[PDB]
Amino acid sequence: MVHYKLTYFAIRGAGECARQIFALADQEFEDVRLDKEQFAKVKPDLPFGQVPVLEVDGKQLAQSLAICRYLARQFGFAGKSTFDEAVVDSLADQYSDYRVEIKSFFYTVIGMREGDVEQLKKEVLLPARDKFFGFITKFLKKSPSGFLVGDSLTWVDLLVSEHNATMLTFVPEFLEGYPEVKEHMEKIRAIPKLKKWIETRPETLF
Amino acid sequence: MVHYKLTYFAIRGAGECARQIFALADQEFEDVRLDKEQFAKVKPDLPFGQVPVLEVDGKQLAQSLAICRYLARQFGFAGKSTFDEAVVDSLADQYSDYRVEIKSFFYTVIGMREGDVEQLKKEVLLPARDKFFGFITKFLKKSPSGFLVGDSLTWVDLLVSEHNATMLTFVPEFLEGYPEVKEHMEKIRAIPKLKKWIETRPETLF
């Protein structure tokens, strides 16, 4: 009976990857959602003054990628070989690079920053989507199973589907010229235990 | 036996982590260093149109973190448990975040960008250094062995020491108020097989 505790804000964000893995493993966990004033208090207790943080029997582990990979390994969603695991990693890092590109837009659209959406939508969110999707679609075309790597689900499938689904709420024309990316989103999120989680989880705007 | 090929520019950069792991494993590998005109040719052949790329018996793997983690796992420099491996990951991601903070400065100082070094040194590099070093020193103070995690060498030890050593060539006052960070740099780079590599490797500006 390993006790898991996830500590993050009351949003999906960077904590969601972990949350979805737990659901797929049918694994109980303490889903702690902090607000700003509460986060400020525990801030110095965290390894890098940041959330999400996972605790496994009290042992702290920060960083969403490291967290989601860890659980993914623990419950068989990391990859079927050490090499495939690395390829999963490579996509997750590319996704991260892509999120750094569209930061500014992302923080401005949800309402955490000053800016013009139509400018940032035009000049930064695109081309960044195109570049990233270009690579994503390549990986899909050589997957017969529909998954990003291998003939099975891995934690990057979750990151990309979730992000795309979330972007659609802000950008309805996201995925319009990329059908392979859409069939992916739907495929992953239609998986029974994930579908169920998506329907029962707390409803938040990102 | 396993044929390894690393393809990167003629610099340490994001390819070095891998190069150092090979040295520590006493592992032969094809250290391919491209120039611009050569990179442009193979660019579309790469998973994300980018280097470094590792090939393991022909199987392509992009992204420096994924690459260095993969080899690190191969040769026992990833961590002694799946949890420790995750903590190593968390530091490597923090390092990456930190590199995004200091990017503008880094690209200006080596000569890939317009800017004022003294401005970027003062307002973006040094604060970022303090924040990051603050976390790095915390991890060291609770390590009796001197290593960042565990009682043994892992691939983050390499990333951090190498980066610090490289920064010193541009910023001589880089580790002046952080003695624990210096003892770390020296400790890692003094390890026989790494020391040897540092002395024999091609000399590049970064």
Side-chain angles (χ1 to χ4, degrees):
Chain A
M1 291 282 80
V2 180
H3 284 74
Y4 297 97
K5 176 188 179 193
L6 191 67
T7 308
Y8 190 55
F9 299 109
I11 51 166
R12 298 186 303 282
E16 191 67 9
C17 195
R19 295 185 181 116
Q20 295 183 45
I21 291 284
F22 284 125
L24 291 165
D26 207 66
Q27 174 60 70
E28 188 58 47
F29 74 103
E30 191 179 352
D31 192 21
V32 180
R33 290 149 188 272
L34 302 169
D35 67 300
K36 28 264 154 60
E37 284 69 24
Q38 224 44 49
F39 166 65
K41 269 165 91 173
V42 286
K43 189 165 184 296
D45 299 357
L46 315 178
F48 313 110
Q50 201 50 259
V51 292
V53 172
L54 177 74
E55 287 186 16
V56 31
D57 297 327
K59 313 199 288 299
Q60 288 186 305
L61 173 64
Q63 287 286 3
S64 42
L65 294 181
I67 290 164
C68 203
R69 183 184 306 106
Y70 169 74
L71 298 159
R73 291 182 177 192
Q74 285 286 121
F75 302 107
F77 303 112
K80 299 294 177 79
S81 61
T82 43
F83 187 83
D84 287 336
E85 280 172 282
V87 175
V88 165
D89 291 346
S90 67
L91 288 153
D93 283 347
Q94 187 68 11
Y95 165 69
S96 301
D97 292 343
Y98 155 72
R99 290 298 289 255
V100 180
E101 293 174 353
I102 75 170
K103 145 191 92 327
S104 83
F105 169 91
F106 191 93
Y107 281 78
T108 285
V109 71
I110 66 163
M112 314 246 74
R113 218 188 297 198
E114 293 288 330
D116 176 36
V117 162
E118 286 298 302
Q119 183 81 300
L120 301 179
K121 202 188 270 190
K122 186 163 178 184
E123 307 186 307
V124 294
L125 175 58
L126 310 187
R129 182 216 37 183
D130 309 34
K131 181 184 169 191
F132 178 54
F133 276 36
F135 304 137
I136 292 298
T137 182
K138 284 156 177 77
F139 270 86
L140 290 162
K141 289 171 116 314
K142 46 175 219 198
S143 171
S145 57
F147 298 107
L148 278 166
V149 341
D151 63 353
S152 78
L153 180 66
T154 64
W155 63 281
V156 70
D157 292 312
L158 308 175
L159 284 172
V160 313
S161 48
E162 177 56 49
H163 169 72
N164 289 332
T166 296
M167 278 299 314
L168 282 176
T169 64
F170 300 100
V171 175
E173 76 283 9
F174 211 73
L175 333 172
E176 92 293 64
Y178 302 92
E180 288 86 10
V181 173
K182 286 197 77 195
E183 70 189 347
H184 168 77
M185 177 188 298
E186 298 168 1
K187 182 199 165 63
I188 300 313
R189 299 169 74 79
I191 295 174
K193 285 180 173 290
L194 174 46
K195 183 179 170 61
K196 185 168 183 80
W197 163 248
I198 293 163
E199 295 184 2
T200 54
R201 68 191 183 185
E203 273 84 50
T204 169
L205 225 73
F206 58 94
Chain B
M1 291 283 155
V2 183
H3 300 144
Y4 297 96
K5 176 188 179 193
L6 191 67
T7 308
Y8 190 55
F9 298 110
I11 50 165
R12 298 187 303 282
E16 191 67 9
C17 195
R19 295 185 181 117
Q20 295 189 23
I21 291 283
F22 284 125
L24 291 164
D26 207 65
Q27 174 60 70
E28 48 269 61
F29 74 103
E30 191 179 352
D31 192 22
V32 181
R33 290 148 188 272
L34 302 169
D35 68 300
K36 175 50 159 60
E37 286 150 74
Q38 242 174 9
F39 167 65
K41 264 59 130 170
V42 76
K43 189 165 184 296
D45 299 355
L46 315 178
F48 312 108
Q50 202 50 46
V51 292
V53 172
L54 177 74
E55 286 186 16
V56 171
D57 296 327
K59 313 199 287 299
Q60 288 186 306
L61 173 64
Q63 288 285 4
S64 43
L65 293 181
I67 289 165
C68 203
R69 183 184 307 106
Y70 170 74
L71 298 159
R73 292 176 90 190
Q74 217 73 331
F75 302 108
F77 304 113
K80 298 294 178 190
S81 60
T82 43
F83 187 83
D84 287 336
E85 280 173 282
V87 176
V88 165
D89 290 347
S90 67
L91 288 153
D93 283 346
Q94 186 68 12
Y95 165 69
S96 302
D97 292 343
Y98 155 73
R99 290 298 262 82
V100 180
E101 293 174 354
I102 74 170
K103 185 189 288 172
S104 72
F105 169 84
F106 190 86
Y107 280 79
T108 229
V109 71
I110 66 162
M112 303 188 74
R113 226 176 78 83
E114 271 293 333
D116 176 36
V117 161
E118 287 298 302
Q119 184 81 300
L120 301 179
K121 203 186 204 194
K122 260 80 181 183
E123 51 155 292
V124 295
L125 174 59
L126 300 188
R129 188 253 340 253
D130 304 16
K131 181 184 169 191
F132 178 55
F133 276 36
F135 303 136
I136 292 299
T137 13
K138 197 166 57 175
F139 270 86
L140 291 162
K141 291 163 137 310
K142 46 175 218 198
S143 170
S145 57
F147 298 107
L148 279 167
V149 341
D151 310 349
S152 78
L153 180 66
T154 65
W155 64 282
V156 261
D157 292 311
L158 307 175
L159 284 172
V160 178
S161 48
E162 177 56 49
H163 169 72
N164 289 332
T166 295
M167 279 300 314
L168 282 176
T169 64
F170 300 100
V171 175
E173 76 283 8
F174 205 68
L175 318 163
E176 288 292 356
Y178 303 92
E180 288 85 11
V181 173
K182 192 159 189 309
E183 294 188 348
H184 179 243
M185 178 179 58
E186 297 297 354
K187 182 199 165 63
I188 300 313
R189 299 168 74 79
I191 295 174
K193 284 180 170 60
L194 174 46
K195 183 179 170 61
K196 182 178 155 172
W197 163 248
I198 293 163
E199 295 185 2
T200 53
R201 68 191 183 185
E203 190 133 40
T204 61
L205 181 72
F206 56 93

